[PDB]
């Protein structure tokens, strides 16, 4: 939009499945490096985890003491369980719809992480919820930790242009997240 | 005294630190009548399967934590050759019979010097799906090498990761939180067990009978017992002692009954 | 006293073994297996049928299948889902309205004392209504039978085929209950509380017994399909394990520490 | 003709634990026989008597053993109250069968095992104090209670049988009540003499604890269990 | 005998009430025997 | 006076199969005697034992026999799974009594008859395979199963008795379930040597198949029948 | 084994005849004729009389006859039409409103197991209501009697003649049922499941037995004809064959292949 | 005896309950005898 966004948000929808048990020390490094880079008070961020229960580990806040208290909690999260990536998206969909009712034309950004890709009965709902969150007005990015089908994340993200490996992920999302900060008010 | 040689067929095994043969649930678990769910004559024991089958098992390092188990299914290790455990003429008969009804007799060897400490918990744990990934498929020989020891996480304590069926796109997939093939790691000593302490013995001796929901079970798809070597106390030594002691096991089926002969099992 | 717990057998001592003491008198036998499971407890709250049903099709059920969910109660202490036996037990934490919420069940009072592997017993089923002045009926079909799902037009009224049969359809009086004891009818010799084998069925899954059940009850209202009401009526199924036997000791569930 | 009856006030009442049968529905079913299955639990006290592991908070990752430091201190190395609701008893078969009941009676049997090296020599004092106003911490305050000295040697286990010292014949199995210094008192493992290890042996060995039931441990009054194992 | 106080009179027969097994042809014993 | 009763929770319940009588209404009726009628069915297993015809789809006009071509092929001439819901068993008395039940137990007895000319000489292999992952088609894959060779001669029938090989004591009589390669396996009629006919004899004779029940075929658990014979 | 099926008698073998095997143990006797028909099943849903009826006149019934159809339940497993015994069973596929739709019946659970020709048994008749809070009554008249069709004015109220009689009129309590066992009252020694002779009656038709029935029940409401209600009330008739005997084995119905 | 579990006590007499035939004056036998 040519009108600048009154708010700007960020959602770290993070996998804590059994598949990321040997990779949580790399996922946690990716989240802290994006939180301690964007220190602007215009940007709020929320930490959503999912293995079996999609659980909001930190609400949509901006207080850098709370986010530091949020990041001290993500370091001590034990991976394990299934991969319910649709319930990672439902906690963000309860926050986009809650923040579309403020009169502020904000901008929701969603970052997803997955090693163990989803079964057919679970990929059907995570593709459905990612269609639901885009209808709520979000921009879904799908950051990929180690080996993953791009096609299984092509439906989840906006396109194949929005799927990134995790080593290139901070190299990608350095200016991709920053592109809308200058676009904002 | 503590020197018991257990001769069986053409394969005998010695031990000089024998605690005793922990016979399970009965006085003699070798005595076993034929199955009552067959109207043919069973293939009983014969002198080419009445013998021990030594196969290796992964080493026990200092890196292993407490309660990290390592499951060896029976007869499921004869069929996938788990730990170099070729079944010989037992697996050559197990593939050709549809139902099989035997009771096991295992023995786990691990030689610790008197300057090591540690305590494996060897137990014949009935009816568990511990060899199966939380995603259905059974573990191959590579995945038993890629982890070497399965950590007792919360998914094993709650039974959250036992295999399930895909409910499909119709049902909303429920948040699975519990399943009855859990391990309570503190209560594995209810099973027929001995503790392989680093200061009393080097060989535990468990002798279990046939148990199962039917009077004889299928040959390819049974897991009615599961050898389960669990670390209660981690290994510790000073620098210079023999690092990474090996663990072996020795499985002998007592009184099998093979029913339902057919050709060799093609999937 | 001096012992060896590596042996695997520790003899249960008393106070008089090490010290000067005496044996306490035996209190009671309430730990008897035939005494301790012979008491009723709730199993599953199921809806009450008001027409000829469609039994839940086996998994993986795809979308668009017009079937009737949450009406059949697979009478089993093991975890079920969608009236069919399962392995894991799943409860919906935040049940959003995408997809059909599958009615799961479990016997909470059983597994906290199911310190064994195999369990065989008769089953007394009491089906208590959860509705004021409900005249319902409790159909049933054994372990290994299926539901007869159609309707036969008697006198221009679609009377379904679950009014009659060779299996017990007990009719309740209004404001009353239904109670009857079911025998052990499964083809397995015992019911596996914990099962480790694979069921060679529609695609094989480890740890899932095929015939570990006493059957499946369902509640219907004795009126034809033209007399269908609007609101949903529930009924509650209590269950008692008559003449219980249990084999092969095993574990009790992991009580957490948080 | 008609026998003139008089039905009581509890007519048409469904009581869940009525000690009585009910009407059959589908009888004359011969079931397949279970003569082949061994190991029938006739009584659930065949499993409280089987010793299971305890769980001690290390100095949800708990540890069934007590690491023994080389530093002298005149407090017990581990100490836990004898109450079968205490969280060193949740995952024993004694404390998880009895938490599903309301009363118990008899002797808890705490089995130890020294899982250190064979060349270690040491002694451990094992004091059960009855409920006092203050938990005994000094070795001299625990020498006076019910103790027993365990010498580490060839045989590596010791079964300290906790006596049943209580006024009431059946103790309450669940002390979740307005609480004090808890009856029934405290078990406490004191190291009497330090563990003398030869050179090139690991410091801090491990005393693996068990908890079984005695030959006179008896339970009474089933209650509805806590269903919080499933959440 | 179980949780059954009916010591006096069984109306239904044993085959109808219970479910007996068909034919194939106190002292709490331990569940593990060291031999 | 009044006997104090206590009616149960199933009072005034109409259960359809209550194993009990009810009140007469119009009694003292002497019925005319049936001593003259012969052949009383005491038991419906007197009719499963009577062999009835099967129905094979020809190479609603089905055929009770198997036409035997003169062309060599190493597949069974006819093959059908041993399941009493299979449509080669709908109109036998074995498969239409047992489809009105829920379980069965025992030996299906497949009787053959060579209805060709008297001057024909040939042999037929008759293999019952237990449930394998793949249906056996080669003669060498069916030589290994339970077979029997039938030589055509003076006597012109052969009663291949299918064994009861199953884990469960009573098999389910109706496999309409999420299906696989079906237990209980496959019967299969292989022609071993070709039928050598003299000149001026009809090519392709006919093996008329029957299907009776054994002397130990037993049924259990009546269910409501399919009423679709009437539409 | 070597046999001759042209002989007509094939001896029922076992596994031990040709092979090495054994006899399986006898499972159960649920195929016993006296056990297998001694269970209740639905027969016919009949309307409930509210005045003095007119019994259906015999065939061929012409138009204009004011009679009462669908009220009488000729208690027979054989196919009936218009409360009179028939040979063929007819169900209306697309029942357009030209002419009176004749209430047919059949015992679907009987003929699928009626593998015999002659069948004699007592009859337990349970008449379950299909209406909430219906106080009805179940009249009856034996095989070979007729319905008494008029009314006698008691106290300026047309009480019909089917309230009294020498045949059992069981009155139901409100919300209750009627259950009574009827003896074998037909003049034939047995009931022909299949009959091949001709009934020398009103014009003779092959294959139609004249007295193969246990009688005819009908439901009425115990009020005089001035207290007639408006809506039509139904009742359902269940039937159990007590003490069944069966003779002369025969065929089971043709299960199609489409 | 049929589907009758009342082994103990018949209230009504045999003529009223059942319907006996008036007078004119296990082992499953085959229904066809080859002679
Ligand atoms: Mg994963």
From Swiss-Prot, chain A:
For the region Interaction with PA, what residue ranges are annotated?
Answer: 119-125
Q: Does the entry annotate any disulfide bonds, and if so which pairs? A: 4-185
Q: Which disease is it linked to?
A: Hemangioma, capillary infantile: A condition characterized by dull red, firm, dome-shaped hemangiomas, sharply demarcated from surrounding skin, usually presenting at birth or occurring within the first two or three months of life. They result from highly proliferative, localized growth of capillary endothelium and generally undergo regression and involution without scarring. GAPO syndrome: An autosomal recessive disease characterized by growth retardation, alopecia, failure of tooth eruption, and progressive optic atrophy in some patients.
Assembly with partners or alone:
Interacts with gelatin and type 1 collagen. Interacts with the actin cytoskeleton.
* Family of this protein: Belongs to the ATR family.
Which ranges sit in the Extracellular compartment?
3-185
What does the UniProt PTM comment say about this protein?
Glycosylated. Glycosylation is essential for Seneca Valley virus (SVV) attachment and entry.
Query: What role does it play?
Result: Plays a role in cell attachment and migration. Interacts with extracellular matrix proteins and with the actin cytoskeleton and thereby plays an important role in normal extracellular matrix (ECM) homeostasis. Mediates adhesion of cells to type 1 collagen and gelatin, reorganization of the actin cytoskeleton and promotes cell spreading. Plays a role in the angiogenic response of cultured umbilical vein endothelial cells. May also act as a receptor for PLAU. Upon ligand binding, stimulates the phosphorylation of EGFR and ERK1/2.
Instruction: Specify the glycosylation sites in chain numbering.
Output: 131, 149
Q: What is this protein called?
A: Anthrax toxin receptor 1
Q: Which domain of life is it from?
A: Eukaryota
What upregulates it? Answer: Up-regulated in cultured angiogenic umbilical vein endothelial cells.
Residues that bind a divalent metal cation, according to the entry?
17, 19, 83
Localization: Cell membrane; Cell projection, Lamellipodium membrane; Cell projection, Filopodium membrane
Q: What is the lineage of its organism?
A: Eukaryota, Metazoa, Chordata, Craniata, Vertebrata
**Which gene holds the coding sequence for this protein?**
ANTXR1
